[PDB]
Structures are given as structure tokens and as C-alpha cells.
Amino acid sequence: SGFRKMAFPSGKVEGCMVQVTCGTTTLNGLWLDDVVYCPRHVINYEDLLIRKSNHNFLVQAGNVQLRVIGHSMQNCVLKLKVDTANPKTPKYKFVRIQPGQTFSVLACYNGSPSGVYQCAMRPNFTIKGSFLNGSCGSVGFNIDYDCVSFCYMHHMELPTGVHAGTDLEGNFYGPFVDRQTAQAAGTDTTITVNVLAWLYAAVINGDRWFLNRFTTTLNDFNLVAMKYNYEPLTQDHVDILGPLSAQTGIAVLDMCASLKELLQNGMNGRTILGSALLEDEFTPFDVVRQCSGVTF
Amino acid sequence: SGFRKMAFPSGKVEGCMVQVTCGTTTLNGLWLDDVVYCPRHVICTSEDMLNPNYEDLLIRKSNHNFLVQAGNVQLRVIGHSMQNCVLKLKVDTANPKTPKYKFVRIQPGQTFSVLACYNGSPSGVYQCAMRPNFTIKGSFLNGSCGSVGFNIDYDCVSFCYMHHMELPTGVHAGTDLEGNFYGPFVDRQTAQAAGTDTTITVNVLAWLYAAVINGDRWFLNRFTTTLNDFNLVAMKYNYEPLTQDHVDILGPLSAQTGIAVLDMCASLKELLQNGMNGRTILGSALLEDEFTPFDVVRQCSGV
Ligand SMILES: CC(C)(O)c1ccc2cncc(NC(=O)[C@@H]3CCNc4ccc(Cl)cc43)c2c1
Ligand SMILES: CC(C)(O)c1ccc2cncc(NC(=O)[C@@H]3CCNc4ccc(Cl)cc43)c2c1
Numbered sequence: 138s139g140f141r142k143m144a145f146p147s148g149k150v151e152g153c154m155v156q157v158t159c160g161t162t163t164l165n166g167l168w169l170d171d172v173v174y175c176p177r178h179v180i181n182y183e184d185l186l187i188r189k190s191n192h193n194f195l196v197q198a199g200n201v202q203l204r205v206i207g208h209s210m211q212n213c214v215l216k217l218k219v220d221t222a223n224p225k226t227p228k229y230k231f232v233r234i235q236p237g238q239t240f241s242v243l244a245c246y247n248g249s250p251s252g253v254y255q256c257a258m259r260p261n262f263t264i265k266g267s268f269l270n271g272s273c274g275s276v277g278f279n280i281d282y283d284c285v286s287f288c289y290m291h292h293m294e295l296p297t298g299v300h301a302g303t304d305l306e307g308n309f310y311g312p313f314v315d316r317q318t319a320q321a322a323g324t325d326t327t328i329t330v331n332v333l334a335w336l337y338a339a340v341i342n343g344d345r346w347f348l349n350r351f352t353t354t355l356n357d358f359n360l361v362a363m364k365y366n367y368e369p370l371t372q373d374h375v376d377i378l379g380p381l382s383a384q385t386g387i388a389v390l391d392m393c394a395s396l397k398e399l400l401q402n403g404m405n406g407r408t409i410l411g412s413a414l415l416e417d418e419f420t421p422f423d424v425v426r427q428c429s430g431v432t433f
Numbered sequence: 434s435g436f437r438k439m440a441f442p443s444g445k446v447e448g449c450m451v452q453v454t455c456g457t458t459t460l461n462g463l464w465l466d467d468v469v470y471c472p473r474h475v476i477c478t479s480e481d482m483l484n485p486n487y488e489d490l491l492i493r494k495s496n497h498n499f500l501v502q503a504g505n506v507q508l509r510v511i512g513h514s515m516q517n518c519v520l521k522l523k524v525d526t527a528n529p530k531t532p533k534y535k536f537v538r539i540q541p542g543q544t545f546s547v548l549a550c551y552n553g554s555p556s557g558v559y560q561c562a563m564r565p566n567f568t569i570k571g572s573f574l575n576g577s578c579g580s581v582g583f584n585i586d587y588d589c590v591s592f593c594y595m596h597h598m599e600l601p602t603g604v605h606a607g608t609d610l611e612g613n614f615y616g617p618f619v620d621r622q623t624a625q626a627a628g629t630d631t632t633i634t635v636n637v638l639a640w641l642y643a644a645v646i647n648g649d650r651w652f653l654n655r656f657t658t659t660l661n662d663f664n665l666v667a668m669k670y671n672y673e674p675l676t677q678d679h680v681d682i683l684g685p686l687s688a689q690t691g692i693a694v695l696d697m698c699a700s701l702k703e704l705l706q707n708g709m710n711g712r713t714i715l716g717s718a719l720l721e722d723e724f725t726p727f728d729v730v731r732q733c734s735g736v
């Protein structure tokens with residue numbers, strides 16, 4: 138029993154974190170094989186980069202200096218070829234995630250990991266992270282079997298205190314740019330499929346006060362959800378919730394009627410899994426994995 | 434900016450997790466140097482748990498009855514001893530991945546990271562706190578016994594918890610790494626129940642200072658309180674008494690924000706009376722008590 142915001146074990150990623158310094162800027166890099174990946178803002182990026190020599194980039198792995206033997210830019214990521222291959226390189230993939238998907242973040246400063254937390258890519262493409270100055274280059278990941286799927290690299294903080302970054306191929310999530318200009322997060326919405334997954338997690342853990350005898354259609358549910366700034370629920374979302382619906386005996390549209398009632402009436406002084414707000418940062422897969430004990 | 438329930442990076446602990454099997458029971462062990470530490474109930478059947486005589490069950494076991502697996506390698510047990518509710522299995526191989534470590538016994542209100550494991554394999558990491566009633570609100574399934582709680586301030590891992598059991602309310606009970614239980618619990622299937630739980634007051638205050646550091650002051654008021662009047666009000670909401678030690682510990686956060694501890698206490702009194710009126714504090718509609726003054730200073734900015 139119990140339900141926590143759980144992150145993947147970070148060990149396979151910790152062994153890849155390095156510190157990258159160029160001039161007066163110090164940030165984090167990801168060392169995989171003989172390449173160090175980091176935000177290109179550490180250095181017109183083509184014009185600024187062509188003026189740099191390999192020895193201008195100082196890369197430190199623990200108490201050992203790695204020597205940069207080459208450099209290239211791919212979108213908003215700088216790839217620094219080093220002379221030493223990381224002996225701790227895990228099995229890995231670079232994957233681009235969609236809004237609503239979750240991942241673990243290993244927050245680092247000066248190439249040293251300080252903490253790990255779980256978060257979701259918001260529908261407005263920002264992440265509600267916990268980052269201070271020097272955290273640039275910290276990475277987001279998931280683990281599938283023994284393979285680390287890197288999905289995020291931290292680049293910046295927006296004026297509202299939320300965060301923006303790229304995939305490991307340097308493509309930003311959202312309409313953001315890596316420079317000092319007027320940028321703002323768009324109006325955010327609630328990830329509906331995730332709230333429903335969390336409601337199924339509450340039922341699995343014995344919290345059932347919000348269940349009712351009613352059902353709804355997908356269309357009537359979507360009309361109500363649009364009014365409360367909830368993301369539209371698709372047939373794909375209904376299909377993805379199938380396993381949780383079979384384990385609890387509560388049809389997806391049956392749970393949608395509970396959600397409709399919670400949006401229209403509130404919680405009435407009651408909590409769900411120790412929360413007075415409807416939680417949207419657990420996917421259906423996260424609920425299944427935590428309520429089944431999947432290991433890595 | 435931002436404030437999250439943040440756990441310590443788990444790598445140093447992952448390299449210590451092993452699987453321990455005795456008869457039909459399989460659980461997790463912690464391999465540090467040439468010793469594997471695990472809950473002593475690994476030698477019990479379900480029937481034995483009603484009234485186990487651990488000394489009698491242990492004397493019937495030899496070294497080769499304990500199977501210890503580290504990854505895909507079997508470790509050989511060359512000795513065994515019991516220390517309180519922990520079994521210590523001497524193995525023939527020292528763990529090459531043994532980090533710098535200490536065994537520390539924590540007090541209620543203290544936080545720590547948990548690496549939840551099954552079959553000697555880590556599945557997840559989360560942050561939690563030792564409740565005033567000595568239980569932890571964890572996320573543990575059957576097979577998670579032997580999973581450990583820790584802090585990593587600098588390069589040293591301080592092991593503070595080993596998971597032993599789940600109570601009827603769904604909360605969890607365990608021991609320090611010397612096998613002494615936290616709370617009045619026994620590693621026996623007996624009618625045990627968690628005592629009435631209370632809110633960790635010093636931690637709620639720390640989290641209110643974290644909200645001020647991050648730019649939110651809506652909850653402050655023009656009042657102050659004496660420590661005794663604060664505690665008379667706090668006890669009515671099932672909040673732990675606030676001691677002079679707690680006031681001292683909040684000193685640094687009080688200096689960084691310019692808000693006296695008893696003025697923050699007055700704000701807490703008003704939040705308990707009024708609720709939040711549709712507002713949130715650091716993205717929460719409830720008063721959060723699982724961040725210590727130390728965790729706030731660690732995660733929040735100095736400016
Ligand atoms: C407020 C403060 C100290 O600058 C800060 C506070 C918290 C931060 C958290 N995560 C990242 C940060 N860096 C940036 O956002 C950097 C520096 C500012 N300008 C800028 C412009 C473009 C790009 Cl791609 C990056 C940055 C943080 C910075
Ligand atoms: C209730 C259920 C399914 O057995 C379960 C569910 C979740 C659990 C989570 N963490 C540990 C668990 N094991 C125990 O509590 C074991 C087995 C039952 N009795 C018992 C009595 C005393 C002692 Cl010291 C240990 C145990 C869990 C078990």
C-alpha cells in the first residue's frame with residue numbers, strides 16, 4: 138500500500154554527469170561514450186562557436202579533466218568529442234516525449250548530482266521543476282528494462298518560475314528559444330488521462346468515496362472538461378486506461394462521471410491519496426508500474 | 434525557482450542491493466563490505482510470525498541455508514549473527530561498490546530517501562519522513578522488506594531505515610540499521626496499530642519560509658504569538674508541540690526572510706483557522722510537513 142511521486146533509480150545517469158566550463162560559464166554535461174552533450178548557450182551561435190578551440194572547453198568528470206578533441210553543434214545542443222570513452226556508459230536511447238508523459242530529473246550543479254524528482258511535460262511544453270542557477274545541462278529520463286531513455290536537457294527558467302529545455306537532439310519542447318528575450322509559458326491545462334489514472338490508483342488503494350452509479354459519453358465528458366481547462370480525452374486515452382478499468386471493475390466513462398462530479402462540486406473537505414487537488418503527474422503506465430513492483 | 438519533494442540520487446545505494454532467500458521467503462539485503470544486512474523475519478514462515486522465537490529458528494540454520502544473490506552472481510555466506518531485529522550475513526566477497534557510509538538513528542520529523550526494491554532489484558526512489566507516531570507513509574508492496582532509507586549529505590551515505598512491515602492502515606514500520614525498531618512495534622503478526630498521527634509543526638513552518646523565499650507572502654499577517662499560546666492552538670488541530678529547539682533550528686530561515694519565528698507561527702495559526710480560500714502554497718492546497726528546515730535550506734535559493 139501507499140502511493141508516492143516516485144522517480145526511477147538515478148545511478149545509471151549519475152555515472153554520466155560531468156561539469157563543462159567555457160569562459161566564465163559553468164554548467165552540466167552528459168558524457169556518453171566519447172561525446173559530452175550540453176546546452177549550446179555555454180559558448181549567432183555559428184559565429185561564436187567558430188571562434189572557439191577545443192582547449193577552450195574545460196570538461197571535468199569527478200576529479201579528472203577530460204580533453205576535448207572535437208566539437209559540433211546539433212540544434213540547441215553542443216557535442217564535445219572527448220579523448221576518453223565513459224566506462225560507465227549505460228545502454229541508452231535518445232527519445233522525444235509528448236506532453237502528458239512523465240520522467241525523472243537528476244538535478245546537478247557543477248557536474249555533481251544533488252537530487253532526483255519526478256515530473257511531467259505540461260501541455261504548454263514547460264516542466265514545473267526545481268532548478269537554481271547552474272542547473273543547465275541537468276537531464277530527464279525514463280528506464281525501460283536496463284536501457285536509459287534520455288528525453289530532456291534543462292536550458293532555462295521562464296519568468297513564472299517554470300522550466301524549458303530540449304530533447305537530447307537539441308530540439309526545444311515548446312515555442313521557446315535559447316536566448317535572453319521576452320518569453321512566457323502559454324496558458325496551461327490539466328492532463329485528463331493522468332487524473333483518471335490517479336483516480337484508479339486511489340481506488341486500488343481503497344479510496345472509493347468519489348465513485349458513483351453514473352456513466353457519461355465521451356462527447357458530454359469533453360464538453361464539461363473543456364470548461365474546466367482540462368485537456369480533451371481521446372479514444373486513445375480510453376484504450377490506454379483499459380487495464381486499470383479491468384483491475385478495478387470501473388469503466389473509463391464510469392470514472393469520467395466521477396471526475397465530472399469532482400470538477401462541478403469539489404472534494405467537500407475530503408482528500409484523495411492525501412491530496413486536496415486532482416493530481417495529473419502520474420500516467421496510466423506509472424500507476425501500473427508502482428502498483429505492481431516493476432524493477433530496474 | 435520551484436519546490437519539489439526531492440530525493441537523494443540513489444546510485445550509491447543501488448550498488449549495495451542484494452536478494453536474500455531462506456527457504457521459501459525472498460527479500461532484500463544491504464551489502465556493505467563483507468556483510469549483508471536484512472530483516473530477521475526472512476527465517477520465518479507465515480505461521481512462525483504469530484509468536485516467533487527467532488533464537489530457536491536461527492540455531493537450526495547453517496550458512497548454506499541462506500542464498501544471497503548480487504546481480505547474476507551468488508555470494509557465499511560464511512557466517513551469521515543476529516543483532517536486535519536484523520540478521521547480519523557474513524559473505525566471502527567484500528562489495529567493491531561499498532560507498533563511504535554511517536548508520537544513523539533518526540528522530541520523528543526527520544526526512545529521508547527510500548530506494549524501494551524487489552528481488553534485490555531497485556524499482557524506484559521517493560522522499561518521505563519519520564512520522565511523529567514512528568511510522569512512514571511509504572509505497573511498498575509485498576517483497577519490499579529489506580528496502581532502505583538514507584540521506585547523502587556530501588559523499589557519505591547515512592543509512593537510517595530498513596523496511597520490515599506494513600500495518601493495517603497501510604502505513605509502514607521498520608528499524609534503524611542496528612535492528613532497533615522505530616516506535617512500539619515488534620516483528621511479529623500481532624495486533625499492533627499506529628498511534629494517532631500528528632502534523633510535524635517545525636516542518637510546516639520551514640515550508641512556509643520556503644514559500645516566502647520563492648515569492649509568496651499572501652498568508653502572512655500583522656500579528657505575533659507567544660510560544661505557549663501557539664501550542665495551545667496547534668494541539669487543537671493535532672499539530673505537534675513546537676519547542677524552543679524548533680524555534681532555534683528555524684533561526685537561519687527567519688534571518689534570510691526577515692520574518693520572526695513567532696510571527697510565522699501567527700500566520701500558521703491563521704491558516705489553521707481560515708484554510709486557504711481557493712489558494713495554494715508552493716502548488717499545494719494542504720499544509721506540507723515532509724520538508725525539514727535543513728531540506729528547505731538545501732533546495733531553496735540563498736537569495
Ligand atoms: C534568475 C536566474 C539567476 O538567472 C536563474 C534562476 C534559476 C534558473 C533555473 N534554471 C536555469 C536558469 N538559467 C537560465 O535561465 C539562463 C540565465 C538567464 N538567462 C537565460 C537565457 C537563455 C537561456 Cl537558454 C538560459 C538562461 C536559471 C537562472
Ligand atoms: C498485507 C500484505 C499483502 O501481506 C503486504 C502488503 C504490503 C507490504 C509492504 N511491506 C511489507 C509487507 N510485509 C509484511 O508486513 C510481512 C508479511 C505480513 N505480516 C508481517 C508481519 C510482521 C512482519 Cl515484521 C512482516 C510481515 C507487506 C505485506
Ligand SMILES: [Cl-]
Nearest residue numbers: 538539540543
Ligand atoms: Cl534526526
